Symmetry: D2
Subunit: 265 residues, 4 copies
Amino acid sequence: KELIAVDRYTVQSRGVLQEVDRKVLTLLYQPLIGCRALALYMTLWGELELLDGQEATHHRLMALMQCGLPDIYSERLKLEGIGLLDTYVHAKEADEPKLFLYELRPPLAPDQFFRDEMLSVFLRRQVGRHLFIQLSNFFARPSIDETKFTQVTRSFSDVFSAVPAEDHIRRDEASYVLDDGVFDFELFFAGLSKQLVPRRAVTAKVKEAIKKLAFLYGIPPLEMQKLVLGVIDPAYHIDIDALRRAAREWYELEHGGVEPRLVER
Amino acid sequence: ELIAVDRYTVQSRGVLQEVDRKVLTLLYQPLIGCRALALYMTLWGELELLDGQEATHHRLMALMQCGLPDIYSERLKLEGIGLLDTYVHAKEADEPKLFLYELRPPLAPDQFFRDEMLSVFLRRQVGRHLFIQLSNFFARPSIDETKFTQVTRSFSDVFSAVPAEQDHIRRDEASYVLDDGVFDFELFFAGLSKQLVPRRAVTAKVKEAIKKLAFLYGIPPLEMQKLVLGVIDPAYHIDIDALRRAAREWYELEHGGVEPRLVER
Amino acid sequence: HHWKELIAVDRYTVQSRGVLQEVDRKVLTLLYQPLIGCRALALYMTLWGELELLDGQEATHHRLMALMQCGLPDIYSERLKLEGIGLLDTYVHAKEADEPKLFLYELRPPLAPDQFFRDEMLSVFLRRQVGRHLFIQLSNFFARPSIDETKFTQVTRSFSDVFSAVPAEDHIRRDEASYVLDDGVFDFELFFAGLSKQLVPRRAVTAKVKEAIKKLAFLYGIPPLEMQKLVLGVIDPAYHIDIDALRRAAREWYELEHGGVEPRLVER
Amino acid sequence: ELIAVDRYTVQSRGVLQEVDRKVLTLLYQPLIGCRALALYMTLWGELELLDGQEATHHRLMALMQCGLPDIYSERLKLEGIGLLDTYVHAKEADEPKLFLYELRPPLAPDQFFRDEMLSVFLRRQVGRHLFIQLSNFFARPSIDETKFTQVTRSFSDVFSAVPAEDHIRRDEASYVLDDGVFDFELFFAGLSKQLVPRRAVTAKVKEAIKKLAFLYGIPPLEMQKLVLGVIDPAYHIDIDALRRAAREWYELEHGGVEPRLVER
């Protein structure tokens, strides 16, 4: 009654499902949710591609996995519980049947999983010490010795210019560094900081924000004082969204919206 | 500088997967060029080919069938745009240098398009039409929260802790959740503040970590109330780790090293 | 001289009947790249990416120039390396009227590492261009320890062992799964007795046909006298048996026998 | 017949890949059932995790969170449908048995649908409507040969040897040596004079000759002796033998220099 074979569903994911997760599904989540749940997750992953947003009835699921509906439901719940599945329901019209949305959520990364208190303990219980060790090493790579090693990596500003023309496995998000001397803040704060819009108001995130449009759009600090002071409210809101448009309109005052080009130095 | 006799290791703290290849080919390549795309792919191949081992730069020269100076030039764009971090080892005795080529995965698509700089450069190099196509490609439909309830079950809903004996494609950190009724917070707080430890010292980071430790280790609020006060930073904050470290020790002395086990409910 | 054939306003499409997978990407980077060079590798990557991005659609080579940040001469030079080495098939649309041309770029997957090393030319080229030490590391990387038959014996079940049909109401290589059926699913002794009486040379039933007969008999429950008929209905004056035609005859026979209900797979 | 303390090892000569997964999920799974899919998946995980190592079946039971009887029966389905080959070690002394689980990748989509039984079973299983979506999913639009003509270039067009100091399938990329690179008439002229049947040169041999001729710059009359050198009394030509003769011949001619691949 919570689920009827004639109820309808669609499978979506606002993220992608890849091969590093496949392994963490089979080797990490498996021990916790059991093997029938793994199949339920793999088939959903399949249905994702097999219907692009198209709608289906649960008979298809039953047919794809050669299983009866009750089993499917019990394992679904497990997938939900452990965070692999968000399940939504459409506003019910009229005299039934239901419409479902299955949002697929990729597993944790290996580092996040072992750093979770419960999941990591629960796992050691189910698999046993020896195996739990082998599993951890499998998802780990040798660490970097920062004693022997100095980072000489060049920055974004050393390689490029903007000119107008006519321990465990984890995903470390790549952040190019925009150095500092590309933009001077004390000079930016010369005719500014006395405004009682103080060093306090501007974040460290907004610091790097403006730093970017400076490089991108070729802004001298004197000019962006007037862009900041233009878009900031009496409430002392610093909004990234508007400040962008200030900078783009600014850039359109002369270069006509050609947009800058990335070039090497 | 960089000479052919110099040595290198290729390492990564992450794994490099299919949407990465598509992001790197369709998003990064228009900025850094193909010649650079080639080097990125080659280093990533080396990662697996040389398992932690050492190599003369003649290898790269041979595998790419390219000359050394070009290799240097393109590597700098990799370093520049944050696809590569390069470290060096200090020199003894007399020559040659040893390099650590650290590979970083690209941004996720949602991130790349949100970078205040990268998205702009791309649209210039690519042209407006192809840019929209690149955006739509890495996009999925957004979920309409107006028509859709979330009926998803929690972790505590489907599992229990029991003792034993001895639009843009993005990366979800997928968090299982624990219903707050798995712990009595009222009692914890109304017996607490008397030490001048506020409800301002409990972050959701702490608030959530309590829930887990409670659930996993079967800790009553009054005992947790004791642990909290134990390692609390004189600064009026809390270190989650130390708190965990306390309960790991607490569970021991109370139950005799007998471990938690995960079960269906 | 690329302008003699390719100009910027010429149009392309990218297609494949294959899917290019991770493994291919390593073979491309480690095996093919030393031979064809780094630039050709990027064009191949770009073409593979284009396969998904353009979805069956047209583009002008301007787009490729923009994606890779290079010019036509280079793209063209490398395109041809991909062609000669087997990585790309190129087709041209029959020209009407005159300008601009329409190219079909048909992507091909690399060889499997076993095929690559077992190739007369590619292996010796690769050794020379990469050196002896690196060559062995590549070979090993693409190899997996063999199976010792002396000490190991095959207990695998066949299809017929595990299933029944009922009416309803060394180098990395690609060894595809070949299920097998026990020759006991069908009585060939009787079957061939029938054919010999009808002057059908035993030679007519090839391994491929015998294999086909087996599957048909098992799937449809066809007795030997009845496959004698089916075979005799589809057989050449040359004594050749067309398996496609036999399959149809079998599919038809089943529709008469059980009334178009189709066979169902079940455990035994 | 299978007990928990029996040992296994997981091995493969292939590498199971992303497409392979979809086929297993959308084409095999309706035949073998979900549980067999998960055992297959698990075995693919173990292949990487135990690097050639040994385990007791306890590990299987623990990873899959399941008992031995089911593991057994689902294993049999994998064997029957062709996804798994099972070997045993001869038993010394007595108990436990050592198994080799050898993983075999799924049929590619074209081979699956072309198969008599699999397509007919899958069809009845999923219903005619879904069977079509499944067909289409594994399909790519064909190449119209009426409107398109191949301009592809061969190996010899692009490269040279020199001495130095529709259903988805696998179309194995076969580079083409357009055979003007070697005069076969000259080769067979004198070879027939030496009374070697033309039947002796199979396709495989002919291919090998062409490739060795181009790679080592071997003239027709020299290939003639080389082949005569390696042909046995049964008129079989061993390619590997012939490769050796051709390499040696190149060494003796150019002084152990090796061939290099270069633009033409």
